[PDB]
Amino acid sequence: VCMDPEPIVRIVGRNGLCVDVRDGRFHNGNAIQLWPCKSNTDANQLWTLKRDNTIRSNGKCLTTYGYSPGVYVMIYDCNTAATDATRWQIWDNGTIINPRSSLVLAATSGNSGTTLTVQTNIYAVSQGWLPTNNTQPFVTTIVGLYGLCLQANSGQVWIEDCSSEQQWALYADGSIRPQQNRDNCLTSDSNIRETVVKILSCGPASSGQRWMFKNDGTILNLYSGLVLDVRASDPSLKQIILYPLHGDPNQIWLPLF
Amino acid sequence: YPIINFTTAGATVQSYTNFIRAVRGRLTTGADVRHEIPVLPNRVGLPINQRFILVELSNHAELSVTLALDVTNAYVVGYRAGNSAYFFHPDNQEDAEAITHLFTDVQNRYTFAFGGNYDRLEQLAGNLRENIELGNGPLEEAISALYYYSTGGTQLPTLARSFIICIQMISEAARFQYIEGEMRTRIRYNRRSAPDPSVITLENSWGRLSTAIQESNQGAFASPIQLQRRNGSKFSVYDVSILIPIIALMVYRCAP
Amino acid sequence: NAQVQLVETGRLSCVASGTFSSYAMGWFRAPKERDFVAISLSGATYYQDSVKGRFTISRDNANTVYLQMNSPEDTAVYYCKATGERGYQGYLEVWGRT
Ligand SMILES: *[C@@H]1O[C@H](CO)[C@@H](O[C@@H]2O[C@H](CO)[C@@H](O)[C@H](O)[C@H]2NC(C)=O)[C@H](O)[C@H]1NC(C)=O
Ligand SMILES: *[C@@H]1O[C@H](CO)[C@@H](O)[C@H](O[C@@H]2O[C@@H](C)[C@@H](O)[C@@H](O)[C@@H]2O)[C@H]1NC(C)=O
Ligand SMILES: [Zn+2]
Ligand SMILES: [Zn+2]
């Protein structure tokens, strides 16, 4: 039976900021915070993922206030807190969910210092998380249809011949952001069949801006169920869309590193 | 044993992918997927009539060579060429007896005094993986060298170099969607190119990459695994998210 | 050095000189820029926003791909377009001759 480790790691999230306890105060009830990722050893930003499905900082539990949308998460003593509120299951989709209440950890504001609330699972960039020490986004060259490269310009995205900008920073919150302006997001406005995906701002952190690279080679919008698609397998159209997964080459991609 | 065909004669990018997709399709039933990553079948409990699959390779010259892949790790254990079979030196003895189930109809089985590991094949071929060019051409010329070694035409260094090509172009491309993509762009432009430090490090990390992902917490590694950019660079991985579009197959190491 | 000849007729009909490989199919429409109309490899489908439901594009690799027009501003010259990977380019694109 597989070994059960308990790694200590930073939980990077919305807009590349990490999971932090406010001000480093560990008294029971203090707010858990969205904060720039540090390069230090202070336990305020390092979290141990224990076997009992609990995220702990300096020995204390990341605890949601209640079991309803809007309540914030506080640091609290693990034994004194309620068992059901101290528990979290981190899914391979980037969300961090609580088994009871069906509420995922959301960051309703990309500003530094946002108290982490817990909201309804709409698979938003606000509620996409990644436990890593790499506190800098992974920047790659995304290659897809016919070997072309995903390129962006001032709000327009398509594929073109791979010229060595075509660079994209894969943020921990599940967003894909053009390198030159990393405040902009790979956004889609609707859960419809041919909504052109382009570059907007990362403010709303909605779904349509959150993407997971599935093992089958696609780039899926988790809330949509449709994948990134070059329209009619035609790069010259300069058009990319969300389309139901069929598996053809015009929706298969690869993050070159 | 299941047989899967490929030919460098008229090989297109799609003719390469469905091949690797068919190889993956028979290397594992896809039943055990852990953290979006599929697992090869467990050596313990696997029937020997399900222990191997065979890939048949042909080329512009219509020379045929059939490789044998160990289902538990997708690595090449041997190959039949016409009337003769050839096997790498087995590591243990349980693997030495399963070899006897492979090419039974042929006359003269052969087992080399060397195993099929990169560092020894690199030693035998006198060249490193970082220098041996990969692509359709190299695979074509390698198919010939495996066929003619039986007739004394192929020498041992060219034999070992052919092994490094096939293993990388088949086994590794099955394990990694990334390395398959590296062979993908080579067919696309008709290139003869040695692999990056990116491909080399992935090949050298596969066993460790499987352990850490399976032995991971529900997502996170207990320890990092350092890798490479296409340009030789520093970067380490701490979670399985970045690896999902990269690793296609994992060796079994433990139970969920 | 040779290419496919997409000869168009027509229910618009279009044939190639290999569609098995040739990726997708594309119909393009007035004496205005050459806008888009409408299949993937399998293939599936991609229609322009003006002509959803009215138009249907079909495929059968085993060398033809159609386009059925059902139900004035759509009057123009329509061309069938092909895509795929290359051996000559950077990728393959073929326009036809209706
Ligand atoms: C997000 O990821 C989690 C990872 O497990 C998914 O949860 C499972 O989904 C399957 C269906 O695919 C259910 O059978 C399981 O009961 C779910 N839970 C577990 C613990 O496996 C979840 O469905 C994913 N959702 C999306 C929209 O991708
Ligand atoms: C590769 O070619 C050989 C003969 O040229 C075929 O027998 C293979 O078919 C495979 O084996 C048979 C027994 C059947 O199960 C079929 O479904 C298999 O695909 C053929 N295989 C492939 C993948 O092309
Ligand atoms: Zn036996
Ligand atoms: Zn080496």
Task: State the ligand closest to the CA atom of B118.
Answer: 4
Chain B residue numbers touching A253 (CB-CB < 8 A): 245
CA B97 to ligand 3 center in whole angstroms: 6
Residue B84: CA count within 13 A, CB half-sphere = 11
Tokens of A139: 């920047």
Q: Any idea what DSSP says for residue B188?
A: H
Residue A229 is labelled as binding a ligand: yes
Q: Does C12 touch chain A (CB under 8 A)?
A: no
Contact B68, B62 (CB under 8 A): no
Phi, psi (degrees; rounded to nearest 5) at A244: -55, 135
Helix then strand count (H, E) for chain A reads: 0, 25
CB pairs under 8 A between A and C: 52
| CA-based torsion, B146, B148, B152, B157: positive or negative | negative
Same domain, B191 and B133: no
Phi, psi (degrees; rounded to nearest 5) at B114: -120, 155
Does any domain span residue C1? no
Phi, psi (degrees; rounded to nearest 5) at B125: -80, -10
DSSP SS3 for A168: strand
The residue from B120, B152, B174 where one domain ends is: B174
The number of distinct structural domains making up chain B is 2
Task: Resolution in Å, one decimal, please.
Answer: 2.8
C-alpha dist (Å) from residue A223 to B206, B250, B255: 32, 28, 31
DSSP SS3 for B6: strand
Chain B residues 151-210 with CB within 8 Å of chain A: 177-178, 181, 184-185, 188-189, 198
The residue from B174, B205, B224 where one domain ends is: B174
CA–CA distance, A173 with A127 (Å, rounded to integer): 7
Same domain, B199 and B157: no
Residues contacting B94, CB < 8 A, separation 6+:
none
Residue at token pair 């329209």: A231
The residue from B141, B174, B207 where one domain ends is: B174
Q: How far is CA B147 from the centre of its chain?
A: 19
CA–CA distance, A11 with A19 (Å, rounded to integer): 5
Same domain, B146 and B251: no
Phi, psi (degrees; rounded to nearest 5) at A167: -105, 140
* Segment (H or E) for B140: helix B136-148
Contact B214, B206 (CB under 8 A): no
Residue B153 is labelled as binding a ligand: no
DSSP SS3 for B130: coil
Residue C13, domain CATH? 2.60.40.10
Which residue range is the domain that position C45 belongs to? 7-95
Residue B217 is labelled as binding a ligand: no
Show the beta-strand stretches assigned E in A109-206: 117-120, 130-131, 138-143, 149-153, 156-160, 168-170, 176-178, 184-187, 198-201
Burial B70-109 (b: 16+ CB within 10 A, else e): bbbbbbbbbbbbeebbbbbebeeeebeebbeebbeeeeeb
CA–CA distance, B170 with B200 (Å, rounded to integer): 14
Residue at token pair 């959150």: A210
Which residue range is the domain that position B202 belongs to? 175-256
Q: Looking at ligand 1, which residue's alpha carbon is closest to its atom 5? A: A91
Same domain, B23 and B53: yes
CA–CA distance, A114 with B185 (Å, rounded to integer): 44
Residue at token pair 């359709």: B136
Residues contacting A28, CB < 8 A, separation 6+:
A60, A74, A75, A76, A77, A80, A81
Q: Domain ranges in chain A?
A: 1-136, 137-257
Residue of C nearest to B187 (CA): C87
CA–CA distance, A242 with B159 (Å, rounded to integer): 48
Residues contacting A180, CB < 8 A, separation 6+:
A165, A167
Check if A99 has its Cβ closer than 6 Å to any atom of ligand 1. Answer: no
The number of distinct structural domains making up chain C is 1
**Residue of A193, A228, A188 lying closest to A204 (CA atoms):** A188
Residues contacting C3, CB < 8 A, separation 6+:
C17, C94
Same domain, B232 and B107: no
| Residues of B assigned a catalytic role | 75, 118, 172, 175
Same domain, B31 and B110: yes
CA–CA distance, A82 with A74 (Å, rounded to integer): 12
Same domain, B125 and B152: yes
